[PDB]
Amino acid sequence: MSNVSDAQIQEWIKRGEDPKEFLLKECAPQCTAWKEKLGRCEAKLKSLVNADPEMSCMYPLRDWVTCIEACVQPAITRNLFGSKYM
Amino acid sequence: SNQFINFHFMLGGFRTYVLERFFKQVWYRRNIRTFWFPVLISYTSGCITMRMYDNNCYDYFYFS
Amino acid sequence: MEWNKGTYMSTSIKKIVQYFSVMTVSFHDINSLFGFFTFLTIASQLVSGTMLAFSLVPEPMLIPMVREEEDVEDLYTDDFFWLHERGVDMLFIFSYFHLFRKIYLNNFEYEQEAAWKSGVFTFLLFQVVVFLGLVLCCTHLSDITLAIAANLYDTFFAGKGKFYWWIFTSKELNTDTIIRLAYLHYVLAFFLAYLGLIHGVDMHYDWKNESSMDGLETEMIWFDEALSNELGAMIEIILIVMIVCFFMYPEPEALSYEFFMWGDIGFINDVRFLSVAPHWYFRPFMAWLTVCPFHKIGLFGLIYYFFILFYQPVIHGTNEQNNYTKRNVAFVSFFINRSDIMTPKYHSVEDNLLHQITFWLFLCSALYVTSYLPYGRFYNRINGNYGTLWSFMYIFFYLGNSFLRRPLITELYLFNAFVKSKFLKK
Amino acid sequence: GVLSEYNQRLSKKLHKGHLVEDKPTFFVTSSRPGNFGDHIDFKVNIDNWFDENRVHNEHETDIRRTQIYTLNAIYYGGLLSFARLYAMGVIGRLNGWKRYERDTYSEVDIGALPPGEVMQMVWNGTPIFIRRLTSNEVKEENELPSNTLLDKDKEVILSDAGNTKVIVVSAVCTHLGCIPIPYLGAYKGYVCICHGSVYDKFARVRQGPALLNLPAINNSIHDEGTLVCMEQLKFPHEPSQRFWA
Amino acid sequence: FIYRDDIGAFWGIKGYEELVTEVGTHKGHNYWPQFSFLGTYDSGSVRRGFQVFARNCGNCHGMIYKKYDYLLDKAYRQLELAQMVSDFTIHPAHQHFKQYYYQEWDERDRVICDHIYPPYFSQDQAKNANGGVWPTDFSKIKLRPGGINYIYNISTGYHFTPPFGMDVPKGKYFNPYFDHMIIGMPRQLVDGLVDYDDGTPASTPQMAYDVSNFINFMQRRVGYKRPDKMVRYYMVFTGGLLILPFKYFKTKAYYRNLLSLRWEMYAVRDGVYYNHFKYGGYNSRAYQFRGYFWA
Amino acid sequence: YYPFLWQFFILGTSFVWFHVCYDPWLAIYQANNAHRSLETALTKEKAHKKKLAEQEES
Ligand SMILES: CCCCCCCCCCCCCCCCCC(=O)OC[C@H](COP(=O)([O-])OCC(O)COP(=O)([O-])OC[C@@H](COC(=O)CCCCCCCCCCCCCCCCC)OC(=O)CCCCCCCCCCCCCCCCC)OC(=O)CCCCCCCCCCCCCCCCC
Ligand SMILES: CCCCCCCCCCCCCCCCCC(=O)OC[C@H](COP(=O)([O-])OCC(O)COP(=O)([O-])OC[C@@H](COC(=O)CCCCCCCCCCCCCCCCC)OC(=O)CCCCCCCCCCCCCCCCC)OC(=O)CCCCCCCCCCCCCCCCC
Ligand SMILES: CCCCCCCCCCCCCCCCCC(=O)OC[C@H](COP(=O)([O-])OCC(O)COP(=O)([O-])OC[C@@H](COC(=O)CCCCCCCCCCCCCCCCC)OC(=O)CCCCCCCCCCCCCCCCC)OC(=O)CCCCCCCCCCCCCCCCC
Ligand SMILES: CCCCCCCCCCCCCCCCCC(=O)OC[C@H](COP(=O)([O-])OCC[N+](C)(C)C)OC(=O)CCCCCCCCCCCCCCCCC
Ligand SMILES: CCCCCCCCCCCCCCCCCC(=O)OC[C@H](COP(=O)([O-])OCC[N+](C)(C)C)OC(=O)CCCCCCCCCCCCCCCCC
Ligand SMILES: COC1=C(OC)C(=O)C(C/C=C(\C)CC/C=C(\C)CC/C=C(/C)CC/C=C(\C)CC/C=C(/C)CC/C=C(\C)CC/C=C(\C)CCC=C(C)C)=C(C)C1=O
Ligand code: HEC
Ligand code: HEM
Ligand code: HEM
Ligand code: FES
DSSP states (O other), rough: TSSSSSSSOOGGGGGGGGHHHHHHHTTTTHHHHHHHHHHHHHHHHOOOOOTTTTTTTTTTHHHHHHHHHHHHHHHHHSSSSSSSOO | OOOOOOTTTTTTTTIIIIIIIIIIIIIIIIIIIHHHHHHHHHHHHHHHHHHHHHHHHHHHHHOO | OOOOOOOOOOOOOHHHHHHHHHOOOOOOGGGHHHHHHHHHHHHHHHHHHHHHHTTSOOOOOOOOOHHHHHHHSSEEEEHHHHHHHHHHHHHHHHHHHHHHHHTTTTTSSSGGHHHHHHHHHHHHHHHHHHHHHHHHOOOOHHHHHHHHHHHHHTTTTTTTTTTTTTSSGSSSSSHHHHHHHHHHHHHHHHHHHHHHHHHHHHGGGGSSSSSSSSOOOOEEEEEIIHHHHHHHHHHHHHEEEEEEEEHHSSOOOOOGGGGGGGOOOOOOOOOTTTTTTTTTTTTTHHHHHHSOOOOOHHHHHHHHHHHHHHHHHHSOOOOOTOOOOOEEOSSSHHHOSSSSSOOOOOOOSOOSSHHHHHHHHHHHHHHHHTTTTOHHHHHHSSOOHHHHHHHHHHHHHTTTOSSSSSHHHHHHHHHHHHHHHHHHHO | OOHHHHHHSSSOOTTTTTOSSSSOOOOOOTOOOSSSSSOOOOOOHHHHHHHHHOOOTTTTTHHHHHHHHHHHHHHHHHHEEEEHHHHHHHHHHHHHOOSSSOOOOOOEOOOOOTOOOEEEEEEEEEEEEEEOOOHHHHHHHHTTOOSBBOSSSOOOOOOOTTTSSSEEEEEOSSSOOOOOBBSSSSSSEEEEESSOOBTTTOBBSSSSSSOOOOOOOEEETTTTTTTEOOOOOOOOOSOOOOOOO | OOOOOOSGGGGGOOTTSSSSOSSSSTBSSSOOOOSSOOOOOOHHHHHHHHHHHHHTTTTOOOEEEEEEGGGTTTTTHHHHHHHTTSSSSOGGOOOOOOTTTOOOOOEEEOOTEEEEEESSHHHHHHHHHTTOOOOOOTTTTTSSSSTTTHHHHHHOOOOOOOOTTTOTTTOOOEEETTTEEEESOOOOOOSSSSSSTTEEEOOOHHHHHHHHHHHHHTTTTTTTTHHHHHHHHHHHHHHHHHHHHHIIIIIIIIHHHHHHOOOOOOOOOOSSHHHHHHHHHOOOOOOHTTSSSSO | OOOHHHHHHHHHHHHHHHHHHHHHHHHHHHHHGGGGSHHHHHHHHHHHHHOOOOSSOO
């Protein structure tokens, strides 16, 4: 009888909508240490008057986005058709 | 043809045949007892030097 | 040629068949079977490479497309390519384990000379073939390897008069260079089989699984009693390698070393020089080049490593004078009040502890050298890894210097104990 | 069983895991040469495995010999299975693999062709003859001498549609591949002019140097001659499965 | 020996430090049916991936090394694939090597045997049409940070904004998954862009997932053959485990049996002198010692 | 006592090895991926096509 009855709820994906936009905000809080580090790095770079061209607020941002996406991507992929549902 | 197919196998228990013979007397007495010190020193030194190299790399990449 | 006295064995089919049907092998362990594994991997490399040669068109602009298309339309071609790559990996692993095992047993004696050098030469040739094989991939890795080899070749001639053209035409991979290098690769790969046969015949003169002289006189008949064990040990090591590769390498991976093989010569012009890395077996030499930014010194280091690896029996051997050779010593002369020192005699393997300590320091230094890429982008601007320099220098010292091998301390201490005991007991 | 044997072997008195003699043992062969004398005090043997390593089956030793042979056979069979996989790989590499058969289906309308006419069509990049035979023509072809015919194995395939049988054959000469004459007054069949090979109206080999009839073209007629399905004959090619699952 | 995990180099592989490469493999685990234990490609997923590739992203990219007929058993049937691919045209200028086989002198409908060329004749034409940056060829694209995930991440990672100190030139877009986080590709996946034949909802994550599955399927080592080869590895490993005991019986027990020898030494005191020991012995390498050693 | 018969026996043992190591893994592998076959996708597409065809306009 399973899978032969109606589905009670429809997700964003089941309606053809993109859920990553909201899921980014959902997963933002837990990656807060890296966000704070990135903010401090940006503040310091803004303060500097003669900054070496090598310096960049890129690697801290790389770590922050890595931590955000590590949570964002698997959650969305698990809801997609074609993959064994979690 | 008149001898055991697998002679002197598991005589005693696992402890005597495996834990005490194949590990303490064959692996440690013969192999580990010879290289535990040099291998440990080299492994620790390599770990420390690689950590220092990575910390210098971090200082290069990351400021603030 | 009166200087050449003759050959140890006449490699004729009749005599080879008789010798291998009457051969006897003493009881041994797995550690003394890396040579058989190397030979079997060589045989499989020959077979798989012959299968691959019928697919590879030596034109650079067709090799990638030909490889991609012939893996689908033809069955087992990609299987043979994978077998060839993994055979190269396992061949390097077995060869280096064999080298370490033979260094451990102190096989630099005179009676081992013919056994030792004939092996090293094979190893040396085994290097060249591998290099040529890389060139056949026609990727950016092949481009960089060819460029480095051409620069090294041109180093000897001080960059004069394009002496490299007969092989490395323009120092670039093109139709002529690819054709020549592929044919040379095939021919030298098949020559390696004969070199290995000669080495295997030579080494049986004095073969020992362990340094200690077991008194056993009975021995196994090679054809099946020893061959079955050799095949089984090969199976066991292959199982272990499969387990280690399965767990250490997840199915999808991030930042592998194969990512530099994306670029195909001709199709992609720009090269991502940020991530340049060869296969792990040639990793130590690229690491040495990065660590030693001086071109001539790096080339000299490579040549010295290989050639001192070849001439171990001469520097560290008895030298036919029965340990009456006199070394040259820097500081011990002041302590002993003698200009030279007689070579020490008691340098056993299993018993003494200094030999084991030094050998395992050397082995761990080699492993650390192959452990990673120095990443020359700022490896020198940032004070480089001191461990890499220490390991390289210890590799150089261990191979060539006889104070780390056959040390005098053991002999002097043993003689001191002998003198004291004899005086006490008269 | 296995548990019983393990229990039996558990209670074994041995020195640090090795079954060795606890006392010196000396054995002298009573029938040794007269010049050997007594055994020397040297203790050559530390183990008595010559006697301990014994299953006392001096009766029916051939059974244990057969068992050892069987174990050897199992080991060799595993090794030979691996070698057979390798040999399959090699030979399959040498002998190509036709993963799938490319499409060759086609359709040509023959109804428009007037009866007793031969038309050339381009199928699979090759010329092909399409002909219509009347009842009188077929009857005339039959009853002719069989001496001229030079193909006992070859036959003729005639369609049944459109009120007149339709024939489709390969328009390639068997001798060397030249295009034969389409129509001749003596016999409205095929007669090659490059060397004089003579065929009949059924494409048979009558009084001609060519030793083979014109190859037939696989076809099936439907829609009463409007839809002549033409697909190249399919031959087996194995292995056919490309994916296990 | 120990590699720091915050440098930006995974397991010590330096380089790729201006990219986000650990997402989906090391930090986070995106599920792909192909790489799961005893897994395999989802036929529907690769089918939809080819549908989206053909209806979009085939207008800039291509797989010169690959051809459509790879999709003949797990993604499409011969007739269906032929009908789908007959919607595109190839000029002879597309061909990498005509070799006298391609006799056409004008555009013609593609067949399943044709290689997957982009609409442009050459790389320079595509580079000129796309603002001077060449849409990379997807054949052999497996060799990217993250592997199969690389296609999925880039197609989706257009949400973040550049930090301070980074300038995105006009015509360029910020995407942290690309080299140096600047990419010349405008975002292509939009909800409802492609109407799947099976009715599956067309959301950008779903389209990215299908595209990634198809692109991976078209590879050679990590592509359509990896699952069967992994099953073959499992079977061979089982065979080795089963054969180990028989190897032991053949080799080690047999050697132990051969060493069950009884030795005896007696005292021979007859008049005979041991002259054979004093005058005897042969050395196979004597020719190397004669005239050279101990003279 | 008949060497070629014993060789046939060895061939049989190798055949048993191959089948033992082959059949179970293949069976479990193709049982695990039953729902990922092309037939499932074809059935889903056919159902969707039928549903779309029945409900439409002129
Ligand atoms: C890092 C990782 C972690 C660490 C890793 C560590 C790794 C460690 C590796 C260690 C390797 C070395 C191991 C050494 C073991 C030594 C054992 C020992 O002491 O033996 C001595 C012993 C005799 O020594 P002895 O000292 O002379 O004896 C003294 C006695 O007092 C007097 O002796 P005797 O004269 O009485 O005996 C003479 C002997 C002489 O007899 C022979 O030589 C005849 C041998 C005939 C072999 C026939 C093989 C048939 C294979 C196919 C079977 C069908 C498969 C169906 C599969 C699908 C099922 C649904 O006959 C016997 O003893 C008869 C016993 C056998 C009965 C018949 C069954 C034989 C086959 C059993 C195995 C196959 C099971 C299949 C699965 C079943 C369901 C679970 O030797 C034997 O008898 C050996 C018999 C053969 C054993 C083979 C075992 C293979 C197992 C494979 C299957 C595994 C489980 C299932 C897996 C399923 C999924 C794939
Ligand atoms: C256009 C067409 C052209 C023609 C094409 C056809 C060409 C035909 C070539 C025929 C060659 C005849 C060779 C005669 C000797 C063969 C062995 C023998 O005596 O047999 C009795 C033997 C009787 O059974 P047994 O009582 O159990 O004894 C087994 C032992 O082998 C019994 O051995 P053992 O323990 O008593 O002692 C073995 C050995 C003691 O051990 C050794 O010393 C071994 C050899 C050491 C040196 C070589 C090392 C490498 C080992 C040999 C190479 C093996 C790999 C070959 C790979 C080839 C390429 C793939 O002692 C000897 O026998 C000394 C002589 C060894 C043979 C060499 C001298 C005679 C033959 C060659 C003379 C001419 C010179 C050669 C160049 C000629 C050029 C024209 O017969 C068998 O067991 C045959 C079993 C066959 C079935 C199992 C394997 C099937 C393959 C499975 C893989 C998948 C493919 C399936 C097959 C597909 C269809 C083919
Ligand atoms: C369709 C095929 C039809 C053909 C026949 C198929 C069956 C053939 C079975 C052949 C025997 C296989 C097992 C023994 C192999 C060695 C053979 C041998 O040398 O025998 C000759 C000989 C015995 O002379 P024999 O009396 O003439 O031969 C009798 C036969 O061998 C027969 O002996 P047995 O009948 O007494 O065998 C009993 C055994 C076999 O009986 C069976 O065949 C039944 C197996 C059923 C398996 C089912 C699995 C699940 C799948 C089915 C699920 C659905 C059904 C559920 C039903 C539920 C019902 C409530 O049943 C057991 O499972 C009990 C064994 C004790 C428990 C051990 C637990 C595992 C410990 C592993 C430790 C490993 C440590 C390594 C690392 C150490 C260092 C750290 O052996 C010796 O003398 C060796 C003694 C020295 C070594 C002792 C080592 C003991 C510890 C290790 C044991 C390793 C094996 C464990 C097997 C576990 C089950 C797979
Ligand atoms: C040391 C050797 C390996 C370690 C373990 C020890 C193995 C030896 C012990 C005895 C084992 C006996 C039983 C083995 C049965 C295996 C069956 C199997 O998987 O093949 C079925 C299949 C049968 O295929 P099939 O006919 O069902 O279908 C083929 C078509 N496809 C691919 C679409 C399914 O075998 C093959 O066809 C494979 C041929 C390969 C030829 C070229 C060699 C490639 C490498 C193969 C081995 C890879 C593993 C690692 C090898 C390392 C050493 C080189
Ligand atoms: C040089 C000494 C031997 C070297 C051994 C290594 C392999 C050498 C292979 C090349 C030489 C082959 C010579 C014989 C030619 C016939 C080959 C053949 O099987 O026919 C294929 C042919 C062609 O296969 P096919 O028709 O499926 O493929 C061709 C057509 N396509 C590509 C469309 C699929 O198949 C047959 O018709 C054979 C049917 C009979 C099968 C039994 C043959 C027995 C005699 C040959 C046995 C060879 C065993 C070799 C074992 C080696 C072990 C290491
Ligand atoms: C410095 O420059 C140089 C180089 O490059 C740098 C060089 O490479 C070299 C060396 C290299 C070369 C000269 C090139 C050589 C290249 C080589 C060896 C590569 C090929 C290697 C191989 C192992 C090829 C193996 C090939 C095969 C197995 C193909 C098998 C094919 C066939 C047909 C086998 C069956 C047929 C036969 C045996 C013929 C017998 C007769 C028949 C069958 C008759 C049939 C007909 C009838 C009517 C019956 C030199 C010297 C050099 O100076
Ligand atoms: C034309 C408008 C394009 C469409 C349609 C698609 N892509 Fe593309 N892509 C395009 C350009 C001009 C570039 C180069 C960007 C640069 O800065 O170099 C790219 C690049 C990619 C990449 C990266 C390739 C690399 O070597 O790193 C990927 C992974 C990629 N594009 C994927 C992709 C996907 C999934 C598309 C939809 C299926 C797609 N592209 C469409 C231009 C165009
Ligand atoms: C001991 C013997 C051999 C060794 C050590 C060896 C080494 C190598 C190596 C290292 C590669 C590159 C692999 C890679 O980059 O991943 C290679 C490729 C290649 N080898 Fe060999 N090889 C040997 C024998 C042979 C033989 C005998 C032939 C031909 C008869 C051959 C033909 C080839 C071909 C064609 C390639 C390239 C295949 C491709 O690019 O698709 N090899 N070899
Ligand atoms: C492809 C390269 C090589 C092959 C194919 C090969 C092959 C073999 C084989 C089969 C054996 C017998 C088995 C064994 O002793 O383990 C052996 C032994 C030996 N090898 Fe090699 N070998 C190679 C490389 C080397 C190297 C690099 C050295 C030394 C630098 C070397 C020196 C020796 C020596 C001295 C022995 C005899 C050991 C002894 O007498 O105890 N070989 N070789
Ligand atoms: S060409 Fe037709 S008969 Fe000679």
